[PDB]
Amino acid sequence: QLKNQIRDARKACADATLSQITNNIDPVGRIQMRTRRTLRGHLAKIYAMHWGTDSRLLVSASQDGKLIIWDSYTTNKVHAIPLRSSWVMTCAYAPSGNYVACGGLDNICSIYNLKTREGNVRVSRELAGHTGYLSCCRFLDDNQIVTSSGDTTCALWDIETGQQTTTFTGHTGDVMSLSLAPDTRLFVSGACDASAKLWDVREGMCRQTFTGHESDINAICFFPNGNAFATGSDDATCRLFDLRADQELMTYSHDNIICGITSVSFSKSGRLLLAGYDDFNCNVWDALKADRAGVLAGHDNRVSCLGVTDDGMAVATGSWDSFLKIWN
Amino acid sequence: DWKSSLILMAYIIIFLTGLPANLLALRAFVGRIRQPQPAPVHILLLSLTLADLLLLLLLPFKIIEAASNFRWYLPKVVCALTSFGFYSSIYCSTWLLAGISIERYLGVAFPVQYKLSRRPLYGVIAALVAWVMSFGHCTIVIIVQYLNTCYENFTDNQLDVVLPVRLELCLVLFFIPMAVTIFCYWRFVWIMLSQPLVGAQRRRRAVGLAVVTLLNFLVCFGPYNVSHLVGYHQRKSPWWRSIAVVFSSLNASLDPLLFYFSSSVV
């Protein structure tokens, strides 16, 4: 049917490999990153983190019963908000920094207003309606939020009205992560069916699908340009997809690596792809030559999550222990 | 003669194994201490390891003295210093072993209360008592040498001073901890042998470990403290003191393997 036509069009479009095109440029030399700052306030396993717009305050969520906002410059803590449910697997930071959203196994990711007249953080809104565990809910805007659950559907809510403004369906497996494009008009969503889809919140329906992985895509990212993105699954491979090509571009795999991917992030210029792993190692792959620029092994159990600041001045990683590290 | 010869490979066989086990156990103990929520178990084990290391560090000083057919070729002050350090380390080790037993007994007798009432402060005060009773009481080493050889050829006043205090040394610093350890281990064995729901292999392993530890405690520090009353009865310094020290030195070498290699590492 149409699948054969799509495959034929994709094959016809591909004429030159990315490795052949990018072999002319010089390879990226080895880079060493050291733990400038370490955070030890947490008492349990952390599962998510996010960076603020100012690239100074970062949020972190764990099962100790609260989520903590840390000032990376001085390592001091400015907020520690207790959670109604200990099981939390996602925390997000609003672009303005006024609100913080977090959710977990319960089908609710709630938003708390950091800035209050009385100076005390209070719960602002609780969103309910999902039929599965929250995977990753991110702040699209101060007025609208995006939620990903395990019921193979995604949602877009209005904070003030507190209802599902838009619903996205079509995924077969459980959705694991989403990433928002810089223009705040497009986003990607990877499911457990070894597939990813592209959705625009303006229309409310899918745009294009991407496949090729042999496992469950648990990490997704987006290129700073916005015309490409990266995915990481349990098959110890990272795949780069292009929106305008609708096909894979590079595969970041090695014989040594057997463990899956836990988190995937891109640098400021999109030249370095930081990928987490279950062997407490983070690999800085080359986004154009698929070369291991560096390996960070400062963690103990496994890199639960990792992120890059807005200005790209540091890379902050959190592991399955109560440890948070900031490199460069 | 044969006694000095036996001393040579006895101290060598203690020496070549005491250091590595303590060295590997110290890193794990300090890592566990630095880890969150340190139980009083870790503090006592760390103190015992430190006492064993102190005992092992003083081994060559006595080894070189005993190598030359039991001849003293070292200053009296330094010999007294090493003797005091050795005896203080021995007494600290035995008091820490006594402290571990009551802590192990309470863990099984009342596990529910032990779980929700633990605090590292209870492990520091108990440990500090061992240091106080070791350093504070072991002052007779200083006064006897400076009163008016290395613990041999005692004069009339030298013998009349050490005999009445050796009984106190054996009574208030050994007899009470030994009785406490025996009672606690007997109670733990009785409790383990009659439990509602425990694994047979785990139960037999725990009982065997308790029996082995009790036997170690009753034969390592036994003869050395018995020699005090033996000398008091004989009104003279016993000649079987070096072998008692050798027997008491077994614990300082076998404690890390008993408390660490208990099925943890094959």
């Binding site: 008492l43 001091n76 | 929700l116």
Partner: protein, 219 residues
């Protein structure tokens, strides 16, 4: 730290660490349990009656010990994507109805498959598993009009209660490959309400004893 703003920042900071330490001190004394079942056994109808959206949290106290039970009923997604969250729990209570062997959802074998996965899971290689063989009253009625050979083709015994109950328990108690590190506490839920509580407290006590002995070096 010399500046007033910096001094206030460090004041709020170590206030936050003090509050975090105070909150986490009671976490160790807390007892956490997981609840599991297959099909209709997923809802713990016999453990959620003590009277004393996804995760369901049950709170109670016994012998000055706080027990918090987490039950998964609405979590119909893949277990492997969130089963690592329940790492370090004191115990797992797996419930399978003894009256499910005859009727076809057959589902008795599905309970074994679910029990095998959790028991042999890499995240549950240390936590003990508590097994409850509930619905014993209905087992007697179904053992007369129907035999045990329908669900157990390899059955080589009579229909006596002692042999039939042991046969079901024996296969459930041999599914753990890590016998040295994992212990399965089997029990039949009696009609009396107090009897069920005591076994859970006794099973938790054994886990506490194992944890206490592990620190002492008797493991």
């Amino acid at each position: 730290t010399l500046s007033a703003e910096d001094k206030a920042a460090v004041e709020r900071s170590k206030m936050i660490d003090r509050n975090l330490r105070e909150d986490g001190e009671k976490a160790a004394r807390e007892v956490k349990l997981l609840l599991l079942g297959a099909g209709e056994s997923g809802k713990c109808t016999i453990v959620k009656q003590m009277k004393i959206t996804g995760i369901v949290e049950t709170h109670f106290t016994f012998k000055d010990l706080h027990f918090k039970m987490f039950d998964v009923t609405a979590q119909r997604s893949e277990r492997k994507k969130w089963i690592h969250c329940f790492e370090g729990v004191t115990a797992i209570i797996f419930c399978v109805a003894l009256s499910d062997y005859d009727l076809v959802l057959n589902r008795m074998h599905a309970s074994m498959k679910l029990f095998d996965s959790i028991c042999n899971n890499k995240w549950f290689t240390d936590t003990s598993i508590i097994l409850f063989l509930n619905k014993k009253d209905l087992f007697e009625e179904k053992i007369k009009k129907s035999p045990l050979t329908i669900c157990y083709p390899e059955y080589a015994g009579s229909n006596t209660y002692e042999e039939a109950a042991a046969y079901i328990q024996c296969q459930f108690e041999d599914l753990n490959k890590r016998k040295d590190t994992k212990e399965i506490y089997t029990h039949f839920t009696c009609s009396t309400d107090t009897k069920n509580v005591q076994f859970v407290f006794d099973a938790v006590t054994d886990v506490i004893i194992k944890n206490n002995l592990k620190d002492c070096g008797l493991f």
